[PDB]
Coordinates of C-alpha atoms and ligand atoms in Angstrom, one line a residue:
Chain A
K1357 CA 82.0 123.2 100.1
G1358 CA 82.8 123.4 103.8
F1359 CA 83.0 121.4 107.1
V1360 CA 81.1 121.0 110.3
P1361 CA 82.0 121.1 114.0
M1362 CA 81.8 117.5 115.1
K1363 CA 82.8 116.4 118.7
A1364 CA 83.7 112.7 118.3
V1365 CA 86.4 110.4 119.8
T1366 CA 88.2 107.6 117.9
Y1367 CA 90.9 104.9 118.7
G1368 CA 93.1 103.3 116.1
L1369 CA 95.8 100.6 115.7
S1370 CA 98.9 100.4 113.6
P1371 CA 98.9 98.5 110.3
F1372 CA 101.7 96.2 111.4
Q1373 CA 99.9 94.8 114.4
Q1374 CA 97.0 92.8 112.9
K1375 CA 96.3 89.8 110.6
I1376 CA 95.2 90.9 107.2
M1377 CA 94.4 88.0 104.8
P1378 CA 92.3 85.7 107.0
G1379 CA 89.3 88.0 106.8
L1380 CA 88.3 87.2 103.2
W1381 CA 87.4 83.5 103.6
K1382 CA 86.2 83.6 107.2
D1383 CA 82.5 82.7 107.1
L1384 CA 81.7 82.6 103.3
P1385 CA 78.4 80.4 103.3
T1386 CA 76.4 82.8 105.6
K1387 CA 77.5 85.8 103.4
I1388 CA 76.5 83.9 100.3
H1389 CA 73.1 83.1 101.8
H1390 CA 72.6 86.7 102.9
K1391 CA 73.4 88.0 99.4
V1392 CA 71.1 85.5 97.7
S1393 CA 68.2 86.1 100.1
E1394 CA 68.6 89.9 99.7
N1395 CA 68.9 90.1 95.9
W1396 CA 66.8 87.2 94.6
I1397 CA 64.2 89.6 93.4
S1398 CA 66.7 91.7 91.5
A1399 CA 68.1 88.6 89.9
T1400 CA 64.6 87.4 88.9
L1401 CA 63.6 90.7 87.4
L1402 CA 66.8 90.9 85.4
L1403 CA 66.8 87.4 84.0
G1404 CA 63.0 86.9 83.5
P1405 CA 62.3 88.7 80.2
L1406 CA 65.4 87.3 78.4
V1407 CA 64.3 83.7 79.1
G1408 CA 60.7 84.4 78.2
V1409 CA 61.5 86.1 74.9
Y1410 CA 64.1 83.5 73.9
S1411 CA 61.8 80.6 74.6
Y1412 CA 59.0 82.3 72.6
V1413 CA 61.2 83.0 69.6
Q1414 CA 62.6 79.5 69.6
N1415 CA 59.1 78.0 69.7
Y1416 CA 57.7 80.2 67.0
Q1417 CA 60.6 79.6 64.6
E1418 CA 60.6 75.8 65.0
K1419 CA 56.8 75.7 64.5
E1420 CA 57.0 77.8 61.3
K1421 CA 59.9 75.7 59.9
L1422 CA 58.2 72.4 60.6
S1423 CA 55.0 73.7 59.1
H1424 CA 56.6 74.7 55.9
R1425 CA 57.8 71.1 55.1
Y1426 CA 56.3 68.6 52.6
Chain B
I1400 CA 128.8 112.8 127.9
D1401 CA 131.7 114.0 125.8
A1402 CA 132.1 110.5 124.4
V1403 CA 128.9 110.9 122.3
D1404 CA 129.9 112.3 118.9
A1405 CA 128.2 112.4 115.5
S1406 CA 128.7 108.8 114.7
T1407 CA 127.1 107.7 118.0
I1408 CA 124.2 110.0 117.5
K1409 CA 123.6 108.5 114.0
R1410 CA 123.9 105.0 115.4
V1411 CA 121.5 105.5 118.3
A1412 CA 119.1 107.4 116.0
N1413 CA 119.1 104.5 113.5
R1414 CA 118.4 102.2 116.4
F1415 CA 115.5 104.1 117.9
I1416 CA 114.0 106.5 115.4
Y1417 CA 114.4 105.1 111.9
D1418 CA 111.4 103.1 110.7
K1419 CA 109.7 102.3 114.0
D1420 CA 106.1 102.5 115.3
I1421 CA 104.7 105.6 117.1
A1422 CA 102.0 106.5 119.5
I1423 CA 100.0 109.7 119.2
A1424 CA 97.4 111.6 121.3
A1425 CA 95.6 114.8 120.4
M1426 CA 92.9 117.0 121.8
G1427 CA 90.8 119.9 120.5
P1428 CA 90.1 121.0 116.9
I1429 CA 92.2 118.2 115.4
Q1430 CA 90.0 117.7 112.3
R1431 CA 92.9 119.0 110.2
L1432 CA 95.7 116.8 111.7
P1433 CA 97.2 114.2 109.3
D1434 CA 96.2 110.6 109.8
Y1435 CA 98.3 107.8 111.2
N1436 CA 99.7 106.6 107.9
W1437 CA 101.1 110.0 107.1
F1438 CA 103.2 110.0 110.3
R1439 CA 104.1 106.3 110.0
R1440 CA 105.4 106.7 106.5
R1441 CA 107.3 109.9 107.3
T1442 CA 109.8 107.9 109.6
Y1443 CA 112.1 107.1 106.6
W1444 CA 113.3 108.8 103.5
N1445 CA 113.3 107.5 99.9
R1446 CA 115.8 110.1 98.7
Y1447 CA 118.7 108.2 100.4
Ligands
LIG1935 C1 105.3 115.1 86.0 C2 106.6 114.3 86.2 C3 107.0 114.4 87.7 C4 106.3 113.4 88.6 C5 106.9 113.4 90.0 C6 106.4 114.6 90.8 C7 107.2 114.7 92.1 C8 106.5 115.6 93.0 C9 106.9 115.3 94.5 O1 107.6 116.1 95.1 O2 106.5 114.1 95.1 C10 107.4 113.7 96.1 C11 106.5 113.5 97.4 C12 107.4 113.7 98.6 O3 106.7 114.1 99.7 P1 107.4 115.3 100.7 O4 106.2 116.1 101.2 O5 108.3 116.2 99.9 O6 108.2 114.6 101.9 C13 108.3 113.2 102.0 C14 109.6 112.8 102.7 O7 110.5 113.9 102.8 C15 110.3 111.6 102.0 O8 110.0 111.6 100.7 P2 111.1 112.0 99.6 O9 111.3 113.5 99.6 O10 112.4 111.4 99.9 O11 110.6 111.6 98.1 C16 110.8 112.5 97.0 C17 112.0 112.0 96.2 C18 113.3 112.8 96.5 O12 113.4 113.9 95.7 C19 114.7 114.5 95.8 O13 114.9 115.4 96.5 C20 115.8 114.0 94.9 C21 115.6 114.4 93.5 C22 116.2 113.3 92.6 C23 117.7 113.1 92.9 C24 118.0 111.6 92.9 C25 118.2 111.1 91.5 O14 112.2 110.7 96.3 C26 111.5 109.9 95.4 O15 110.7 110.3 94.7 C27 111.9 108.4 95.3 C28 111.5 107.9 93.9 C29 112.5 106.9 93.3 C30 113.2 107.4 92.1 C31 112.3 107.1 90.9 C32 112.7 108.1 89.7 O16 106.0 112.2 97.4 C33 104.7 112.0 97.9 O17 104.4 112.8 98.8 C34 103.8 110.9 97.4 C35 103.2 111.3 96.1 C36 102.5 110.1 95.5 C37 102.1 110.4 94.0 C38 101.0 109.4 93.6 C39 99.8 110.2 93.0 C40 99.0 109.3 92.1 C41 97.5 109.3 92.6 C42 96.6 109.6 91.4 C43 96.7 108.6 90.4 C44 95.9 109.0 89.1 C45 95.4 107.7 88.4 C46 96.0 107.7 87.0 C47 94.9 107.2 86.0 C48 94.6 108.2 84.9 C49 95.3 107.9 83.6 C50 95.6 109.2 82.8
LIG1936 C1 53.9 96.3 90.3 C2 54.3 96.9 91.6 C3 54.5 95.9 92.7 C4 54.9 96.6 94.0 C5 53.8 97.4 94.5 C6 54.1 97.9 95.9 C7 54.6 96.8 96.8 C8 55.6 97.4 97.8 C9 56.7 96.4 98.1 O1 57.2 96.4 99.2 O2 57.0 95.4 97.2 C10 58.1 94.6 97.6 C11 58.9 94.0 96.5 C12 60.3 93.8 96.8 O3 60.6 94.7 97.9 P1 61.1 94.0 99.3 O4 59.9 93.7 100.2 O5 62.0 95.0 100.1 O6 61.9 92.6 99.0 C13 63.3 92.5 99.5 C14 63.7 91.1 99.5 N1 65.2 91.0 99.6 O7 58.6 94.7 95.3 C15 59.4 95.8 94.9 O8 59.8 96.6 95.7 C16 59.5 96.1 93.4 C17 58.2 95.8 92.7 C18 58.5 95.7 91.2 C19 57.9 96.9 90.5 C20 57.4 96.5 89.1 C21 56.9 97.8 88.3 C22 56.5 97.3 86.9
LIG1937 C1 77.1 95.8 79.7 C2 76.1 96.3 80.7 C3 76.2 95.4 81.9 C4 75.4 96.1 83.1 C5 75.9 95.5 84.4 C6 75.0 96.0 85.6 C7 75.6 97.2 86.3 C8 74.6 97.7 87.3 C9 75.3 98.7 88.3 C10 74.4 98.8 89.5 C11 75.2 99.4 90.7 C12 75.2 98.4 91.8 O1 76.3 98.1 92.3 O2 74.0 97.8 92.4 C13 74.2 97.3 93.6 C14 73.0 96.4 94.1 C15 72.8 96.6 95.6 O3 73.9 97.2 96.2 P1 73.7 98.2 97.4 O4 72.3 98.1 97.9 O5 74.0 99.6 97.0 O6 74.8 97.8 98.6 C16 74.3 97.0 99.7 C17 75.5 96.3 100.4 N1 75.1 95.1 101.0 O7 73.3 95.1 93.8 C18 72.2 94.3 93.7 O8 71.1 94.7 93.9 C19 72.3 92.8 93.4 C20 71.6 92.4 92.1 C21 72.3 91.3 91.4 C22 71.3 90.6 90.5 C23 72.1 89.8 89.4 C24 72.3 88.4 89.8

Protein backbone atom coordinates (compact mmCIF):
# COMPACT_ATOMS: atom_id res chain seq x y z
CA LYS A 1 0.00 0.00 0.00
CA GLY A 2 2.03 2.91 -1.36
CA PHE A 3 2.11 5.63 -4.00
CA VAL A 4 3.91 6.36 -7.26
CA PRO A 5 5.75 9.40 -8.67
CA MET A 6 3.46 10.90 -11.26
CA LYS A 7 4.28 14.20 -13.03
CA ALA A 8 0.87 15.59 -14.08
CA VAL A 9 -0.72 19.06 -14.30
CA THR A 10 -4.34 19.93 -13.43
CA TYR A 11 -6.58 23.02 -13.45
CA GLY A 12 -9.74 23.42 -11.39
CA LEU A 13 -12.60 25.84 -10.74
CA SER A 14 -14.48 26.77 -7.58
CA PRO A 15 -17.84 25.14 -6.76
CA PHE A 16 -19.66 28.48 -6.64
CA GLN A 17 -18.86 29.49 -10.23
CA GLN A 18 -20.79 26.96 -12.34
CA LYS A 19 -24.33 25.77 -13.05
CA ILE A 20 -25.12 22.49 -11.33
CA MET A 21 -28.60 21.11 -12.07
CA PRO A 22 -28.97 21.62 -15.88
CA GLY A 23 -26.59 18.72 -16.52
CA LEU A 24 -29.04 15.95 -15.61
CA TRP A 25 -31.68 16.47 -18.31
CA LYS A 26 -29.46 17.88 -21.06
CA ASP A 27 -29.65 15.34 -23.91
CA LEU A 28 -31.61 12.40 -22.48
CA PRO A 29 -32.77 10.62 -25.70
CA THR A 30 -29.27 9.96 -27.04
CA LYS A 31 -28.15 8.62 -23.65
CA ILE A 32 -31.20 6.34 -23.51
CA HIS A 33 -30.49 5.11 -27.04
CA HIS A 34 -26.85 4.43 -26.18
CA LYS A 35 -27.76 2.47 -23.04
CA VAL A 36 -30.36 0.38 -24.87
CA SER A 37 -28.08 -0.34 -27.83
CA GLU A 38 -25.25 -1.32 -25.49
CA ASN A 39 -27.15 -3.56 -23.04
CA TRP A 40 -29.86 -5.13 -25.22
CA ILE A 41 -28.00 -8.46 -25.10
CA SER A 42 -27.77 -8.45 -21.30
CA ALA A 43 -31.48 -7.61 -21.04
CA THR A 44 -32.34 -10.40 -23.50
CA LEU A 45 -30.25 -12.98 -21.66
CA LEU A 46 -31.71 -11.96 -18.30
CA LEU A 47 -35.37 -11.97 -19.35
CA GLY A 48 -35.46 -14.91 -21.79
CA PRO A 49 -35.54 -18.02 -19.58
CA LEU A 50 -38.19 -16.56 -17.26
CA VAL A 51 -40.61 -15.93 -20.14
CA GLY A 52 -39.92 -19.32 -21.73
CA VAL A 53 -40.44 -21.29 -18.52
CA TYR A 54 -43.55 -19.32 -17.55
CA SER A 55 -45.19 -19.88 -20.94
CA TYR A 56 -44.30 -23.59 -20.89
CA VAL A 57 -45.75 -24.11 -17.40
CA GLN A 58 -48.94 -22.20 -18.23
CA ASN A 59 -49.48 -24.23 -21.41
CA TYR A 60 -48.86 -27.55 -19.66
CA GLN A 61 -51.19 -26.76 -16.76
CA GLU A 62 -54.08 -25.58 -18.93
CA LYS A 63 -53.73 -28.61 -21.21
CA GLU A 64 -53.79 -31.01 -18.26
CA LYS A 65 -56.75 -29.30 -16.59
CA LEU A 66 -58.81 -29.23 -19.78
CA SER A 67 -57.95 -32.87 -20.48
CA HIS A 68 -59.18 -34.01 -17.05
CA ARG A 69 -62.74 -32.76 -17.70
CA TYR A 70 -65.88 -34.72 -18.60
CA ILE B 1 -1.92 54.36 10.72
CA ASP B 2 -2.58 54.75 14.43
CA ALA B 3 -6.31 55.07 13.64
CA VAL B 4 -6.61 51.32 12.91
CA ASP B 5 -7.47 49.52 16.15
CA ALA B 6 -8.81 46.04 16.92
CA SER B 7 -12.36 46.89 15.84
CA THR B 8 -11.22 48.12 12.42
CA ILE B 9 -9.02 45.04 11.99
CA LYS B 10 -12.03 42.81 12.68
CA ARG B 11 -14.25 44.85 10.36
CA VAL B 12 -11.85 44.77 7.40
CA ALA B 13 -11.07 41.10 8.02
CA ASN B 14 -14.77 40.24 8.01
CA ARG B 15 -15.06 42.24 4.78
CA PHE B 16 -12.12 40.62 2.94
CA ILE B 17 -11.23 37.25 4.51
CA TYR B 18 -14.31 35.61 6.04
CA ASP B 19 -16.10 33.23 3.65
CA LYS B 20 -14.64 34.34 0.31
CA ASP B 21 -13.15 32.56 -2.68
CA ILE B 22 -9.42 31.85 -3.01
CA ALA B 23 -6.81 31.21 -5.69
CA ILE B 24 -3.98 28.69 -5.28
CA ALA B 25 -0.88 27.71 -7.23
CA ALA B 26 1.55 24.96 -6.25
CA MET B 27 4.62 23.31 -7.75
CA GLY B 28 6.71 20.27 -6.91
CA PRO B 29 5.85 17.16 -4.89
CA ILE B 30 2.36 18.42 -4.05
CA GLN B 31 0.62 15.03 -4.08
CA ARG B 32 0.05 15.44 -0.31
CA LEU B 33 -1.47 18.98 -0.46
CA PRO B 34 -5.13 19.23 0.63
CA ASP B 35 -7.65 19.69 -2.16
CA TYR B 36 -9.62 22.83 -2.97
CA ASN B 37 -12.67 22.06 -0.83
CA TRP B 38 -10.48 21.75 2.27
CA PHE B 39 -9.13 25.29 1.87
CA ARG B 40 -12.51 26.69 0.83
CA ARG B 41 -14.31 25.28 3.86
CA ARG B 42 -11.60 26.36 6.23
CA THR B 43 -12.43 30.10 5.65
CA TYR B 44 -15.10 30.12 8.38
CA TRP B 45 -15.60 28.55 11.79
CA ASN B 46 -18.60 26.61 13.09
CA ARG B 47 -17.55 27.00 16.73
CA TYR B 48 -18.71 30.63 16.75
C1 LIG C 1 -18.42 9.95 19.18
C2 LIG C 1 -19.21 11.22 19.51
C3 LIG C 1 -18.41 12.45 19.08
C4 LIG C 1 -18.66 12.74 17.59
C5 LIG C 1 -18.02 14.09 17.23
C6 LIG C 1 -16.51 13.94 17.09
C7 LIG C 1 -15.87 15.33 16.94
C8 LIG C 1 -14.42 15.20 16.46
C9 LIG C 1 -13.99 16.49 15.77
O1 LIG C 1 -13.13 17.16 16.24
O2 LIG C 1 -14.60 16.89 14.58
C10 LIG C 1 -14.54 18.27 14.34
C11 LIG C 1 -13.88 18.53 12.99
C12 LIG C 1 -13.21 19.90 13.03
O3 LIG C 1 -12.11 19.94 12.17
P1 LIG C 1 -10.75 20.75 12.64
O4 LIG C 1 -9.55 20.09 12.02
O5 LIG C 1 -10.62 20.67 14.14
O6 LIG C 1 -10.81 22.33 12.19
C13 LIG C 1 -11.93 22.83 11.51
C14 LIG C 1 -12.07 24.33 11.75
O7 LIG C 1 -11.31 24.70 12.86
C15 LIG C 1 -13.53 24.70 11.99
O8 LIG C 1 -14.24 23.61 12.52
P2 LIG C 1 -14.67 23.63 14.11
O9 LIG C 1 -13.45 23.40 14.97
O10 LIG C 1 -15.28 24.97 14.45
O11 LIG C 1 -15.77 22.44 14.39
C16 LIG C 1 -15.63 21.67 15.55
C17 LIG C 1 -16.69 22.07 16.56
C18 LIG C 1 -16.08 23.03 17.58
O12 LIG C 1 -15.64 22.33 18.71
C19 LIG C 1 -15.33 23.14 19.80
O13 LIG C 1 -14.21 23.50 19.98
C20 LIG C 1 -16.42 23.57 20.78
C21 LIG C 1 -16.87 22.36 21.60
C22 LIG C 1 -18.34 22.49 21.97
C23 LIG C 1 -18.57 23.81 22.69
C24 LIG C 1 -19.83 24.48 22.13
C25 LIG C 1 -21.06 23.88 22.80
O14 LIG C 1 -17.75 22.69 15.90
C26 LIG C 1 -18.80 21.83 15.56
O15 LIG C 1 -18.64 20.65 15.59
C27 LIG C 1 -20.16 22.39 15.16
C28 LIG C 1 -21.22 21.32 15.42
C29 LIG C 1 -22.52 22.00 15.86
C30 LIG C 1 -22.87 21.54 17.27
C31 LIG C 1 -23.64 20.22 17.20
C32 LIG C 1 -23.56 19.50 18.54
O16 LIG C 1 -14.86 18.50 11.99
C33 LIG C 1 -14.44 17.96 10.76
O17 LIG C 1 -13.31 18.06 10.43
C34 LIG C 1 -15.43 17.24 9.84
C35 LIG C 1 -15.73 15.84 10.37
C36 LIG C 1 -16.95 15.28 9.64
C37 LIG C 1 -17.38 13.97 10.29
C38 LIG C 1 -18.23 13.15 9.31
C39 LIG C 1 -17.73 11.71 9.30
C40 LIG C 1 -18.81 10.79 8.73
C41 LIG C 1 -18.27 10.05 7.51
C42 LIG C 1 -18.44 8.55 7.71
C43 LIG C 1 -19.93 8.20 7.78
C44 LIG C 1 -20.09 6.72 8.12
C45 LIG C 1 -21.43 6.21 7.59
C46 LIG C 1 -22.29 5.71 8.76
C47 LIG C 1 -23.11 4.49 8.33
C48 LIG C 1 -22.77 3.29 9.22
C49 LIG C 1 -23.88 3.06 10.24
C50 LIG C 1 -23.29 2.42 11.49
C1 LIG D 1 -22.37 -19.61 -26.89
C2 LIG D 1 -21.19 -18.65 -27.00
C3 LIG D 1 -21.52 -17.53 -27.99
C4 LIG D 1 -20.33 -16.58 -28.10
C5 LIG D 1 -19.14 -17.32 -28.70
C6 LIG D 1 -18.01 -16.35 -29.02
C7 LIG D 1 -18.58 -15.09 -29.66
C8 LIG D 1 -17.71 -13.90 -29.28
C9 LIG D 1 -18.57 -12.64 -29.25
O1 LIG D 1 -18.07 -11.59 -29.45
O2 LIG D 1 -19.94 -12.72 -29.00
C10 LIG D 1 -20.52 -11.45 -28.92
C11 LIG D 1 -21.83 -11.49 -28.13
C12 LIG D 1 -22.02 -10.15 -27.40
O3 LIG D 1 -20.80 -9.46 -27.37
P1 LIG D 1 -20.66 -8.03 -28.17
O4 LIG D 1 -20.24 -8.29 -29.59
O5 LIG D 1 -19.63 -7.16 -27.48
O6 LIG D 1 -22.11 -7.24 -28.17
C13 LIG D 1 -22.20 -5.99 -27.54
C14 LIG D 1 -23.44 -5.26 -28.04
N1 LIG D 1 -23.75 -4.17 -27.13
O7 LIG D 1 -21.88 -12.61 -27.27
C15 LIG D 1 -21.26 -12.60 -26.01
O8 LIG D 1 -20.29 -11.95 -25.78
C16 LIG D 1 -21.84 -13.48 -24.92
C17 LIG D 1 -22.24 -14.82 -25.54
C18 LIG D 1 -23.18 -15.57 -24.60
C19 LIG D 1 -22.45 -16.76 -23.99
C20 LIG D 1 -23.45 -17.89 -23.76
C21 LIG D 1 -22.77 -19.04 -23.03
C22 LIG D 1 -23.79 -20.13 -22.73
C1 LIG E 1 -32.66 -9.46 -5.79
C2 LIG E 1 -31.56 -9.69 -6.83
C3 LIG E 1 -31.60 -8.59 -7.89
C4 LIG E 1 -30.28 -8.57 -8.67
C5 LIG E 1 -30.12 -7.24 -9.40
C6 LIG E 1 -28.95 -7.31 -10.37
C7 LIG E 1 -27.70 -6.70 -9.75
C8 LIG E 1 -26.53 -6.87 -10.71
C9 LIG E 1 -25.35 -5.99 -10.31
C10 LIG E 1 -24.39 -5.92 -11.50
C11 LIG E 1 -23.42 -4.76 -11.34
C12 LIG E 1 -23.64 -3.74 -12.46
O1 LIG E 1 -23.85 -2.61 -12.19
O2 LIG E 1 -23.59 -4.11 -13.81
C13 LIG E 1 -23.42 -3.02 -14.66
C14 LIG E 1 -23.64 -3.40 -16.12
C15 LIG E 1 -22.64 -2.66 -17.01
O3 LIG E 1 -22.08 -1.59 -16.31
P1 LIG E 1 -20.50 -1.20 -16.61
O4 LIG E 1 -20.06 -1.88 -17.89
O5 LIG E 1 -19.64 -1.65 -15.47
O6 LIG E 1 -20.35 0.43 -16.78
C16 LIG E 1 -20.37 0.98 -18.06
C17 LIG E 1 -20.76 2.45 -18.00
N1 LIG E 1 -21.38 2.85 -19.25
O7 LIG E 1 -24.94 -3.03 -16.49
C18 LIG E 1 -25.46 -3.70 -17.60
O8 LIG E 1 -24.82 -4.51 -18.18
C19 LIG E 1 -26.88 -3.39 -18.06
C20 LIG E 1 -27.74 -4.65 -18.01
C21 LIG E 1 -29.19 -4.28 -17.74
C22 LIG E 1 -30.10 -5.40 -18.22
C23 LIG E 1 -31.45 -5.33 -17.50
C24 LIG E 1 -32.43 -4.52 -18.34
